[PDB]
Amino acid sequence: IQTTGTQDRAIWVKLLWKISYPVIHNLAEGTLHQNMPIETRSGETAGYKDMTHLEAVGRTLAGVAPWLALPDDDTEEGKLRKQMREEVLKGLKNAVDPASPDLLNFTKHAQPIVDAAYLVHAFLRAPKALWEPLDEVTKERYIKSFQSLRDRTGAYNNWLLFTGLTESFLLGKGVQYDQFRIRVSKNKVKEWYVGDGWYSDGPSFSMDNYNAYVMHSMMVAMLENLLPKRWASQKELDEAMNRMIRHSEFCERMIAPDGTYPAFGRSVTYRTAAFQSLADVALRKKLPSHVSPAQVRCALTAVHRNMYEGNQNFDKDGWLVLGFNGHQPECADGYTSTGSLYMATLSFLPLGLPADDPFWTDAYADWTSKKAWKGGHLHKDYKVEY
Amino acid sequence: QTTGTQDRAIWVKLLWKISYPVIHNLAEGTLHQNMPIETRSGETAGYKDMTHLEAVGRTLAGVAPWLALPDDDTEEGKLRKQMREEVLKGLKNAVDPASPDLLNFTKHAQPIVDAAYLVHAFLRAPKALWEPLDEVTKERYIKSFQSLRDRTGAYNNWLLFTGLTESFLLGKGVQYDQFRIRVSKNKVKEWYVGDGWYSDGPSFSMDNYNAYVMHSMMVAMLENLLPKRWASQKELDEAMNRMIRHSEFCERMIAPDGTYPAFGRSVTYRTAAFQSLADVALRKKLPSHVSPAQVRCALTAVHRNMYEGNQNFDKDGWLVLGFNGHQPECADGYTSTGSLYMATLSFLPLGLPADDPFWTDAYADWTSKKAWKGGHLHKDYKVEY
Amino acid sequence: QTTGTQDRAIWVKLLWKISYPVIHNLAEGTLHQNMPIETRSGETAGYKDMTHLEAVGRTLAGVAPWLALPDDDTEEGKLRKQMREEVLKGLKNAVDPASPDLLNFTKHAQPIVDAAYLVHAFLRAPKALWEPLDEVTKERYIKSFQSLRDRTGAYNNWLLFTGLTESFLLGKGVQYDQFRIRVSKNKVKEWYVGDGWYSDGPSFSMDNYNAYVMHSMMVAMLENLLPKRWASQKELDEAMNRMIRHSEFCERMIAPDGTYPAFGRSVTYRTAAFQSLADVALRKKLPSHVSPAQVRCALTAVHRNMYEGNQNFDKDGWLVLGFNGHQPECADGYTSTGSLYMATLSFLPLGLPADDPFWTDAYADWTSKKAWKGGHLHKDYKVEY
């Protein structure tokens, strides 16, 4: 029994709302610090307290932004989009308001480097919906907030993209940016490419979801910012773009016939963020020839329902819990807390395609593994050299 | 749920279902007369020169551990006894100049690959499959392996094929190629990219060839090199630990429904995707948070999902081109019927005896099966070695 | 042949000849007024914004060790105190916003390079050249160094300039850029290719830039990071031994006639090609088969062949574009008069006191001078660290 693309879209909307609205509405009401849980594996909240809310806000907005970039209309979904966008804009104003209880932390610890970069990515996926409407004083505060990060740093790995993307955003805004951060993060990430659509997360190859969590989406987004200033070439952007496209094939292929996907590597608590590269490629209308938009929609539909339709991944008040499919704090990394979990929005990027795009209107289609395992047509795969 | 005893009888049944047509036909000298030469295009020229050694080498590499067990009086023991005798008969025929089943070693580059799988069979069961051969046949295999040195293939995992063969000749006390051993070992080490993965040649390739070739053969080669001082104990341990780490990903990619993703080239090798998991389990080197029982139960579900029904077999019981079903469109141009017998390579845990904890411990869910129903989920993390 | 004492007086004369015009004009506020701005193209636009910091930073980085010596009233002691007082005066001028010799830190990427050489002077003579500065002047240099963070240059040895500058700021207890230190340290370590050589950026460059920048500044940077646990003692030892190794080649390339090859880019930097040799010598870390006296004597010959005559000097005592002579055809487009004061960087041994054995041991032929006469030639061999 299949669903239609229009039914699938409605499901995604319900599920994305279920994930993100607690974060967005509390931020808008100024009650995010007050109400969000701070669940950690250890149970300690010290330290986590200073960073988890920027984690929730940046990671949530990074995933809902394409949806909120769509032009307004009077349809039912269009009303939901308008409402969430208004609450987001209200929370974004609070988040840098010194009188707001939800003033977010940018000045302390290395962690905000990460989450500022996901916030920046939201601004890049929806400039006209989420950045341009901000009043000038709010805009200037975000500029200074991003510039204040430069006295700290994180690991020698995918973290280079966080500070690289942030500076590339500042460059795109015509404000003062750090050329060193832009240059070394680009070249380093290029040196870390190991083949067949995969980078190493730092000097050693890591078989995990971090290529989807950080590397492809942000390498591409950063290079796009750098092209007009000639800080990167079209060749470099096409290169990173095609490596993301290739990576998305493996990620669509690892969705099983039952709609599950393997749990592997660190930060498994990010759940369907493991599909951000497939979600980004779908949003950009760049799926490879043999991988239909419908089959990606349907594959990610099954995964979305498998992980967010029931309440196994949510607490009594609708917040995400530590775990994978269930309350499983034993798989949370020591650096993870409740706000970290909002990477979960990053598979919902194709809601930034309009409701009349083929991704949402083509008929249901089995995905690769589902075809493979019932004897259907199974396209030949092969590693690439670019 | 089935018991571990029942699981073993299923693996026996399905490993027999796969391997017996190759083994019995070679035993009877009718493998050339009887084995299909299915290709995606349908052409059989060229393929016909190489496909029968593919079937034999790949089949034997996978059944060799089972056939290595000590004999006993059980019903399974009789099956082992019967199969081993037919293998020994086929191996004599395979290098007999007057047998219609004489195998090709001199034409094409492809024999380099499948001689290495046969060598791997000899290495997994030396007392059972090599030593009982008569000396004339042993000498013929020695010369057959040495005659491979005029050709070569791709600059990738293929280097392990010739390194492993040469490490076998070394281990046998006959003349071997030191250059093949020195460069193959060093290049494979240079291709390690991290977290249990090698690049299949200069460029990383997200596929099953780390399982098909690289881990098992690098470990097995270093095992031959070590007593002869062509590798150090630390080099062996390093390759061993890298294979063990790799088997973690492979156990984790078995889904709750017993399936696993179809990705990368040579997907027609089916469950050979699990040779590194199977090699680690046979070696009883599974990390402490991955129970022997969950590996048994995971691979049982995969084995039944791929081999219990007949979707992957033709009317005569031979493997067909595909993944789960008749899917010729996913077969590489280099693949034929004989190539498909990689399918044996997930059955190495039959090389543990019936009373090993792998086969007696109670049923256990595997990693994703637990993860997806809210059960306990061990935290994973990339390693640095 | 000369004695050590006559060699020291020669080096003092020649270092003074090179450096005094820069230092004395800076002290007098007349550096911008009097220093030529000679370029291959003949253009001064752009170059005039940067060429004076180049002059100052490069001159100071090379005279710093000598000025670090304790004071005494010998004829040389008088010269050291005269020059030090004029450096201290010029350094105040260089950041005084009303001084005519105010230096540029904010325009172009080039200040990143020459601020680093000025930092290196401060690192080589902290009690002589940094501590005596007034607090306003100190804070100005701190702010100047931090204002560089909006620019960058080439993806090569330049990473050490910003890495070393930030390591100085860290050592001064002020706000420093951690990202700059982390990636510069790791990238430069990644560019080590072997036998005492780094690649200048991603592709190996057979030129003098290992001496111009990489060894001396890697070591000095790790020295600053060590007490703050931003580098290990193992990392510093590695860099130190790599520089020691590198100096062996540089001492071996001085010919029996006291010349050395002209090769690679920025050949106009003249004896700065021997900075790693000079640095290892000053640190009293020459390998056992290379005596201090043979380094003194080889570098004395080079120093006299390059600086005693006036072939490399214009009518006013400034350095000219060239190698040994007026040779603007070999000057890079990025080079001007100020750039040439890299020539000080081989006089680091003057930072060893006048009774150090480098300056008192009997004359000794250097490696190639012995080799080409039939004398003892120590066996060389590439190293694995």
Next chain:
Amino acid sequence: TTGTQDRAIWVKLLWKISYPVIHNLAEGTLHQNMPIETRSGETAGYKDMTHLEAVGRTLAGVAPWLALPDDDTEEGKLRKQMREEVLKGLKNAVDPASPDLLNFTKHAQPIVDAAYLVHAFLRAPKALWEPLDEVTKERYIKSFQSLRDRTGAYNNWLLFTGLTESFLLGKGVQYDQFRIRVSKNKVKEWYVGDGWYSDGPSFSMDNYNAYVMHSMMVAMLENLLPKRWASQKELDEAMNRMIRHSEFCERMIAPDGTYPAFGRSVTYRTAAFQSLADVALRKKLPSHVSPAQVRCALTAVHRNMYEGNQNFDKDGWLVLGFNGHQPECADGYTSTGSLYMATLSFLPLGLPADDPFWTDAYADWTSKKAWKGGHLHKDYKVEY
């Protein structure tokens, strides 16, 4: 001086080096008469390998000169005399009855010097290979094929077996495809930049880029090209890397005609200039480096090293050292036969006497110009 006088100096010095090896081999008295000097004084082990070292290393350097057509000049008479003695010694060297039968089967070392012998055959095929009788030809093919049971270091040694197999490929006999494929790919991977390879996994600042890597990579690739074991771009790449490398070697000749002693195997002496001599012979010098200044720089080197007797023993054999008797700088693997690398800087004698390399007016080399205030071409590392 004139290039014609220089050329006569090179002929005389090349003969001074090589004629002891060649003449004794043609007489069958090489084993009897050649010393086996070592730093330790031991001769065991060395005695099994050092003679092929002298023959292979000598012939690799004299081969271009002996490829020249015969003519009635005085120099022509010397070439035909030397060539005929080489052909005689070559027959002897694989004659199972000859006292100068060379070892190919014992130790790893013959892998090296068979490659140098192969390089002599590649450098002068019509003069030193074709005239050999068929049975002697057969014996060499077998001797080269018998090397496949042994190997040496994981470094420049790969080129020895690669070049040898490419020779067998070129002769249409049975060859090792694996040796050709891996040696080609490994050496490409060891290229670090600016005309230098690492000698194995770790970069080594020494003369082995000139000793082995450039000339043998290029020669091997030329054999592979027509058989589709290498492409034209691959050959062009290795050629341009050799050409770039010769610039540094030409620049390290000092104004006094010396050059720095550095790195291992320094006892090979002017073989440090094989890549320069090879590019000169190939007439591929970069446009700012005149053939004449190369001729003249190497004449100063060749005289500083070979005109006097500081590098020879009482019987005209090379002795261990650099410039003088300096056995303290010889590696433990080096013996008397090893020293005949010294021929490898003489390749441009393979240009005829009327080539511009030998008739262009005297010119100062790069450092001689630079140090007297002459013109100095701007150098810059390359990216290919």
